[PDB]
Amino acid sequence: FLEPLLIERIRSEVPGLAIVSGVPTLSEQDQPAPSAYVVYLGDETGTGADHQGGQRAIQTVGQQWAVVLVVHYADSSNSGEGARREAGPLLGRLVKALTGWAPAIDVAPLARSARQSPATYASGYLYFPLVFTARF
Amino acid sequence: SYCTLADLIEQYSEQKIREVSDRVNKPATTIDTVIVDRAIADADSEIDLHLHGRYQLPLASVPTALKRIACGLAYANLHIVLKEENPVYKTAEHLRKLLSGIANGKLSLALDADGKPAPVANTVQISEGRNDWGADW
Amino acid sequence: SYCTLADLIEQYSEQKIREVSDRVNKPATTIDTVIVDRAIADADSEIDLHLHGRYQLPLASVPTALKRIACGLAYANLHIVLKEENPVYKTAEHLRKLLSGIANGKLSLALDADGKPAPVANTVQISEGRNDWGADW
Amino acid sequence: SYCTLADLIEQYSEQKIREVSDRVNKPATTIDTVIVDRAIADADSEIDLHLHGRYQLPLASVPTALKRIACGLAYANLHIVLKEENPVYKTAEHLRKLLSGIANGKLSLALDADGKPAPVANTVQISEGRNDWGADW
Amino acid sequence: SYCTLADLIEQYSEQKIREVSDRVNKPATTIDTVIVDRAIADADSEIDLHLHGRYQLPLASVPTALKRIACGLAYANLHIVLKEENPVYKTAEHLRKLLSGIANGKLSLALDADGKPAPVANTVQISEGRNDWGADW
């Protein structure tokens, strides 16, 4: 219950052309700019372990959080050259800022996943079903 | 030049002008004067297109409504991609509606600072008037 | 100057004017007088655009309805981004409808404090009237 | 002054007037007389806008229907933000419809207490009437 | 040549022109001058189609509105596939609407730099005028 203090800098208006898009199916044909395009998948819950405490019946609630990549630059049905090759550094930047960059945390792990996040394509332009953990 | 960079900054804040004008630095750092000048020139050209049939082109003074219209159109022109539901597009459409109303003689071009604008002589023309036998002979 | 900063504060409370006028401090602390002045000037320019064909431009007095209209338009102008369904936009549209009704001669410009406004001489014009042989000769 | 603070309290209860008038204290404690006065003045200005073409402006008496209309418009003006589906907005629209009907000569302005209002002399005007040879010479 | 490569770069940034003009290298590296020239020529041809009936074809000067229209049409032409809801398509449609309004005599072609354009002599034609017996004989 303290993430906003760092979320403020986590979010930095990634797209320069998209304005008031309310970003978080994709168009892939008329998007003004390659915005972050965050997505939500689900949640993780469990008890009977170190997560659960005493009063208030709360536990360390597992949280899910994913993103969608929209570049379509150098990849317009030609080949996957420049779609993720350029994203690599961008993917690292996104995964390091939006996740893994947490405030002073005691019971808020803010789990981050640098690797082991497979993504498969479809629709003929670009799909990226990212899989990351939040834990908070 | 119905509007200037100062007018754009005042109407839309310097941050937004910097964001929509700096295209080479990410994040933006400075306002590109050339891009702003071109956008303002395009807005002025559209306004002149709308106002050529009722007033003189090289206006010696800028009416305030003209300043607001020019600022809005210039800001709308600074967007490389502008969708239909973008509120800036709606503001541009409203300003264009105001311009069309002015052109069709439903709205008057207001005072500049204290004096009236300069309407063209389109309505003045009459043949000449032949009225001999009526000159107190 | 059909409305002032005092009128805006009274109509919309000082907090809202501070929030929509202070663009450099987050959270807002003071009301920017220059921005408010420009918004009021733009509202006055639009109102003059609507009223130029029926009354004199440099009005010596401000009718109360004119004050309300100017305050509403000025507040609507203080929003950098204004969507269609924003209630402030709807209020601005209603005020513009009132202005258009006034321009089309369906509504009259009310009293300022005790006296009437000053209509223009547009309707007065007639040729002159030649009626010799009818002057009690 | 077609309505007063007493009329607003009586029509909408003192609690609601306090809630919509006190903007600086949360929860509200007192009714701000200045804000209520401005709202009533704005309602009166709109009503005069609607009634200027058929009656004299400085009415010496307030018809009861005028009191109800003024109270409704004043209450609607005390809302900083008013959406379209708010019932108060609908009541204001109905009252404006009544005013427009009065202006267009479909409704008559009722009795004030016992006597009629004072219509303007707009319909009275006729040239003068030249009827010599018909004066019992 | 109502617009040039410099105008396209200034209006849409060099990156976008490079992306939509370089078809052989992925990712794009350089702007193809031939493709841009053909797109600009096509835009000019469409504009001439719209303007042939009111002005001379080989214009000696380019009005600013004409520059904006040409830039927009040229950018729209650089897209091999352009869908209906693409905002660039909407901008092209708006510019075509402006051109049609100019052709139908609802908008005037503005100043080029300081002087007027050159309208055609279509309206000038009259028979000749036979008015013997009226030459002060």
Coordinates of N, CA, C and O in Angstrom, one line a residue, chain D residues 20-78:
Chain D
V20 N -25.2 23.4 -0.8 CA -24.8 23.8 -2.1 C -24.2 25.2 -2.1 O -23.7 25.7 -3.1
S21 N -24.3 25.9 -1.0 CA -23.8 27.3 -0.9 C -22.5 27.4 -0.1 O -21.7 28.3 -0.4
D22 N -22.2 26.6 0.9 CA -21.0 26.7 1.7 C -19.9 25.8 1.0 O -20.0 24.6 1.0
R23 N -18.9 26.5 0.5 CA -17.9 25.9 -0.3 C -16.6 25.8 0.4 O -15.6 25.1 -0.1
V24 N -16.4 26.5 1.6 CA -15.1 26.5 2.3 C -15.1 25.6 3.5 O -14.0 25.2 3.9
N25 N -16.2 25.3 4.1 CA -16.3 24.4 5.2 C -16.9 23.1 4.8 O -17.9 23.0 4.1
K26 N -16.2 22.0 5.3 CA -16.6 20.7 5.0 C -16.7 19.9 6.4 O -15.6 19.6 6.9
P27 N -17.8 19.6 6.9 CA -19.2 19.8 6.4 C -19.6 21.2 6.5 O -19.1 22.0 7.2
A28 N -20.7 21.6 5.7 CA -21.1 23.0 5.6 C -21.7 23.4 7.0 O -22.3 22.5 7.7
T29 N -21.6 24.6 7.3 CA -22.1 25.2 8.6 C -23.1 26.3 8.4 O -24.1 26.4 9.1
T30 N -22.8 27.2 7.4 CA -23.6 28.4 7.2 C -23.9 28.6 5.7 O -23.1 28.1 4.9
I31 N -24.9 29.4 5.4 CA -25.3 29.7 4.1 C -24.5 31.0 3.7 O -24.6 32.0 4.4
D32 N -23.8 31.0 2.5 CA -23.1 32.1 2.0 C -24.1 33.0 1.3 O -24.6 32.7 0.3
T33 N -24.3 34.2 1.9 CA -25.3 35.1 1.3 C -24.8 35.7 -0.1 O -25.6 35.9 -0.9
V34 N -23.5 35.9 -0.2 CA -23.0 36.5 -1.5 C -23.2 35.5 -2.6 O -23.6 36.0 -3.7
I35 N -23.0 34.3 -2.4 CA -23.1 33.3 -3.5 C -24.6 33.2 -3.9 O -24.9 33.1 -5.1
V36 N -25.5 33.1 -2.9 CA -26.9 33.1 -3.2 C -27.4 34.3 -3.9 O -28.2 34.3 -4.9
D37 N -26.9 35.5 -3.5 CA -27.2 36.7 -4.2 C -26.8 36.7 -5.6 O -27.5 37.1 -6.5
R38 N -25.6 36.2 -5.9 CA -25.1 36.2 -7.3 C -26.0 35.2 -8.1 O -26.3 35.5 -9.3
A39 N -26.3 34.0 -7.5 CA -27.1 33.1 -8.3 C -28.5 33.7 -8.6 O -29.0 33.5 -9.7
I40 N -29.1 34.4 -7.6 CA -30.4 35.0 -7.9 C -30.3 36.1 -8.9 O -31.2 36.2 -9.8
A41 N -29.2 36.8 -8.9 CA -29.0 37.9 -9.9 C -28.9 37.3 -11.3 O -29.4 37.8 -12.2
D42 N -28.2 36.2 -11.4 CA -28.0 35.5 -12.7 C -29.4 35.0 -13.2 O -29.7 35.2 -14.4
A43 N -30.1 34.4 -12.3 CA -31.5 34.0 -12.7 C -32.3 35.1 -13.2 O -33.0 35.0 -14.2
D44 N -32.3 36.2 -12.4 CA -33.1 37.4 -12.8 C -32.6 38.0 -14.2 O -33.4 38.4 -15.0
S45 N -31.3 37.9 -14.4 CA -30.7 38.4 -15.7 C -31.2 37.6 -16.8 O -31.6 38.1 -17.9
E46 N -31.2 36.2 -16.7 CA -31.7 35.4 -17.7 C -33.2 35.6 -18.0 O -33.7 35.7 -19.1
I47 N -34.0 35.8 -16.9 CA -35.4 36.0 -17.0 C -35.7 37.3 -17.8 O -36.6 37.4 -18.6
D48 N -34.9 38.4 -17.4 CA -35.0 39.6 -18.1 C -34.7 39.5 -19.6 O -35.3 40.1 -20.5
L49 N -33.6 38.7 -19.9 CA -33.3 38.4 -21.3 C -34.5 37.9 -22.0 O -34.8 38.2 -23.2
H50 N -35.3 37.0 -21.3 CA -36.4 36.4 -22.0 C -37.6 37.3 -22.1 O -38.4 37.2 -23.0
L51 N -37.7 38.3 -21.1 CA -39.0 39.1 -21.0 C -38.8 40.5 -21.4 O -39.7 41.3 -21.3
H52 N -37.6 40.9 -22.0 CA -37.4 42.3 -22.3 C -38.3 42.8 -23.5 O -38.6 44.0 -23.5
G53 N -38.7 41.9 -24.4 CA -39.4 42.4 -25.6 C -40.9 42.5 -25.4 O -41.5 43.0 -26.3
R54 N -41.4 42.1 -24.3 CA -42.9 42.1 -24.0 C -43.3 42.9 -22.8 O -44.5 43.4 -22.8
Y55 N -42.4 43.2 -21.9 CA -42.8 43.9 -20.7 C -41.6 44.9 -20.3 O -40.5 44.8 -20.9
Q56 N -41.9 45.8 -19.4 CA -40.9 46.7 -18.9 C -39.9 46.0 -18.1 O -40.3 45.0 -17.4
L57 N -38.7 46.4 -18.1 CA -37.6 45.7 -17.4 C -37.8 45.9 -15.9 O -38.0 44.9 -15.2
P58 N -37.6 47.1 -15.3 CA -37.7 47.2 -13.9 C -39.2 47.0 -13.4 O -39.9 48.0 -13.0
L59 N -39.6 45.8 -13.3 CA -40.9 45.4 -12.9 C -41.1 45.9 -11.4 O -40.2 45.7 -10.6
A60 N -42.2 46.6 -11.2 CA -42.5 47.1 -9.8 C -43.1 46.0 -8.9 O -43.1 46.1 -7.7
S61 N -43.5 44.9 -9.5 CA -44.1 43.7 -8.8 C -43.6 42.4 -9.4 O -43.3 42.4 -10.6
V62 N -43.5 41.4 -8.6 CA -43.0 40.1 -9.0 C -44.2 39.1 -9.1 O -44.8 38.8 -8.1
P63 N -44.6 38.7 -10.3 CA -45.6 37.6 -10.4 C -45.1 36.3 -9.8 O -43.9 36.0 -9.8
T64 N -46.1 35.5 -9.3 CA -45.7 34.3 -8.6 C -45.0 33.3 -9.5 O -44.0 32.7 -9.0
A65 N -45.5 33.1 -10.7 CA -44.8 32.2 -11.6 C -43.3 32.7 -11.8 O -42.4 31.9 -11.9
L66 N -43.1 34.0 -11.8 CA -41.8 34.5 -11.9 C -41.0 34.2 -10.7 O -39.8 33.9 -10.8
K67 N -41.6 34.2 -9.5 CA -40.9 33.7 -8.3 C -40.5 32.3 -8.4 O -39.3 31.9 -8.1
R68 N -41.4 31.4 -8.9 CA -41.0 30.0 -9.0 C -39.9 29.8 -10.0 O -38.9 29.1 -9.7
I69 N -40.0 30.5 -11.1 CA -38.9 30.3 -12.2 C -37.6 30.8 -11.6 O -36.6 30.2 -11.9
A70 N -37.6 32.0 -11.0 CA -36.4 32.5 -10.4 C -35.7 31.6 -9.4 O -34.5 31.4 -9.4
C71 N -36.6 31.0 -8.5 CA -36.0 30.1 -7.5 C -35.4 28.9 -8.2 O -34.3 28.5 -7.8
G72 N -36.1 28.3 -9.2 CA -35.5 27.2 -9.8 C -34.2 27.5 -10.5 O -33.2 26.7 -10.4
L73 N -34.2 28.6 -11.3 CA -32.9 28.9 -12.0 C -31.8 29.2 -11.0 O -30.6 28.9 -11.2
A74 N -32.1 29.9 -9.9 CA -31.1 30.2 -8.9 C -30.5 29.0 -8.3 O -29.3 28.9 -8.1
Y75 N -31.4 28.0 -7.9 CA -30.9 26.8 -7.4 C -30.0 26.0 -8.4 O -29.0 25.5 -8.1
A76 N -30.4 26.0 -9.7 CA -29.6 25.4 -10.7 C -28.3 26.1 -10.9 O -27.3 25.4 -11.2
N77 N -28.2 27.4 -10.6 CA -27.0 28.1 -10.8 C -26.0 27.9 -9.6 O -24.8 28.1 -9.7
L78 N -26.5 27.4 -8.5 CA -25.7 27.2 -7.3 C -24.9 25.9 -7.4 O -24.1 25.6 -6.5

